[PDB]
Design an enzyme around this catalytic site. Sequence first.
Site, short mmCIF file in Angstrom:
data_model
loop_
_atom_site.label_atom_id
_atom_site.label_comp_id
_atom_site.label_asym_id
_atom_site.label_seq_id
_atom_site.Cartn_x
_atom_site.Cartn_y
_atom_site.Cartn_z
N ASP A 183 54.76 55.75 82.82
CA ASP A 183 53.61 56.66 82.55
C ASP A 183 53.92 58.13 82.38
O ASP A 183 53.01 58.97 82.36
CB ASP A 183 52.50 56.41 83.60
CG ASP A 183 52.91 56.71 84.98
OD1 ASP A 183 53.91 57.48 85.16
OD2 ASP A 183 52.20 56.28 85.91
N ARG A 208 52.22 63.38 81.46
CA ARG A 208 51.78 62.24 82.29
C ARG A 208 50.57 61.61 81.58
O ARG A 208 49.63 62.33 81.19
CB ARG A 208 51.37 62.84 83.65
CG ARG A 208 50.76 61.84 84.65
CD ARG A 208 51.71 60.72 84.96
NE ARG A 208 51.22 59.96 86.15
CZ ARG A 208 50.31 59.01 86.10
NH1 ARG A 208 49.78 58.63 84.95
NH2 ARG A 208 50.02 58.29 87.21
N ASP A 265 48.27 54.16 85.91
CA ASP A 265 49.36 54.27 86.88
C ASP A 265 50.24 53.07 86.66
O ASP A 265 49.82 51.93 86.83
CB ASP A 265 48.77 54.29 88.31
CG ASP A 265 49.81 54.64 89.37
OD1 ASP A 265 50.71 55.46 89.07
OD2 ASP A 265 49.64 54.07 90.47
N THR A 266 51.45 53.35 86.25
CA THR A 266 52.50 52.29 86.22
C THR A 266 53.25 52.29 87.52
O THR A 266 53.32 53.28 88.17
CB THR A 266 53.52 52.54 85.07
OG1 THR A 266 54.01 53.90 85.09
CG2 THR A 266 52.87 52.29 83.70
N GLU A 274 56.34 52.60 89.95
CA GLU A 274 57.54 53.42 89.88
C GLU A 274 58.67 52.48 89.58
O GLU A 274 58.53 51.25 89.71
CB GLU A 274 57.80 54.17 91.21
CG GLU A 274 56.69 55.12 91.69
CD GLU A 274 56.45 56.32 90.78
OE1 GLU A 274 57.45 56.84 90.24
OE2 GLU A 274 55.26 56.75 90.62
N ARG A 321 52.85 69.17 84.43
CA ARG A 321 52.91 68.09 83.42
C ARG A 321 51.67 68.14 82.58
O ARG A 321 50.57 68.39 83.07
CB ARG A 321 52.98 66.68 84.08
CG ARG A 321 54.12 66.59 85.04
CD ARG A 321 54.25 65.17 85.64
NE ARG A 321 53.12 64.93 86.50
CZ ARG A 321 52.92 63.78 87.16
NH1 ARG A 321 53.83 62.79 87.18
NH2 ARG A 321 51.76 63.59 87.77
C1 LIG Z 1 47.30 61.13 86.10
C2 LIG Z 1 47.05 62.40 86.94
C3 LIG Z 1 47.84 62.65 88.06
N1 LIG Z 1 47.59 63.82 88.75
C4 LIG Z 1 48.39 64.12 90.00
C5 LIG Z 1 47.63 63.36 91.11
C6 LIG Z 1 48.75 62.86 91.98
O1 LIG Z 1 49.06 63.89 93.00
P1 LIG Z 1 50.15 63.55 94.16
O2 LIG Z 1 51.52 63.85 93.58
O3 LIG Z 1 49.75 64.63 95.17
O4 LIG Z 1 50.00 62.18 94.62
C7 LIG Z 1 49.97 62.70 91.02
C8 LIG Z 1 50.15 61.24 90.63
O5 LIG Z 1 51.15 61.17 89.57
P2 LIG Z 1 52.26 60.08 89.56
O6 LIG Z 1 51.58 58.69 89.52
O7 LIG Z 1 53.03 60.41 88.32
O8 LIG Z 1 53.07 60.19 90.79
O9 LIG Z 1 49.61 63.47 89.90
C9 LIG Z 1 46.61 64.70 88.36
O10 LIG Z 1 46.43 65.73 89.09
N2 LIG Z 1 45.83 64.50 87.31
C10 LIG Z 1 46.02 63.35 86.56
O11 LIG Z 1 45.29 63.16 85.63
CA LIG Z 2 53.18 56.20 88.49
#
Ligand SMILES: Cc1cn([C@H]2C[C@H](OP(=O)(O)O)[C@@H](COP(=O)(O)O)O2)c(=O)[nH]c1=O
Ligand SMILES: [Ca+2]
Length: 129
Positions: free
Chosen positions: A15, A29, A34-35, A37, A75
């Site tokens: 993702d 991103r 959510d894929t 890890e 991102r």
């Molecule tokens: C997809 C997405 C993730 N995020 C943030 C929330 C999550 O915070 P935390 O890092 O505090 O958990 C993290 C999840 O991404 P990942 O699934 O890439 O880890 O990215 C956003 O803020 N907005 C979004 O649209």
């Molecule tokens: Ca992920």
Amino acid sequence: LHKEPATLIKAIDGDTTKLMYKGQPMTFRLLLVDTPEFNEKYGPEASAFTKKMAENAKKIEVEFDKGQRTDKYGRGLAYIYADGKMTNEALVRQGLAKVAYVYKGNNTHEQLLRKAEAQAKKEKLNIWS
Ligand SMILES: Cc1cn([C@H]2C[C@H](OP(=O)(O)O)[C@@H](COP(=O)(O)O)O2)c(=O)[nH]c1=O
Ligand SMILES: [Ca+2]
């Protein structure tokens, strides 16, 4: 929403991908998914799927939603298309991502993706097997 050009710099995982957008390198991103890890089950299959889809594409596009365009990690937050096919949706349809991280005001394609997830789950694909 509008599709804008980008080119693949490098695959990252199921993702996230590194694209050049407006001439600058950015990690994107994928909105609304959510894929697993890479270290988790189906993580490798998700990574392979997004890498293949982006590498094989003649045309990558990014489409921002209405809300925030970058997350707290810097991102880019977008829907990513490979020769017109939405990667976010394809991952969900194949059972390689779950619909997730649905924040208000960046959720335009939510219901399209939920419909794919229902189909994947019906077919018992991958994550739903
Ligand atoms: C997809 C997405 C993730 N995020 C943030 C929330 C999550 O915070 P935390 O890092 O505090 O958990 C993290 C999840 O991404 P990942 O699934 O890439 O880890 O990215 C956003 O803020 N907005 C979004 O649209
Ligand atoms: Ca992920």
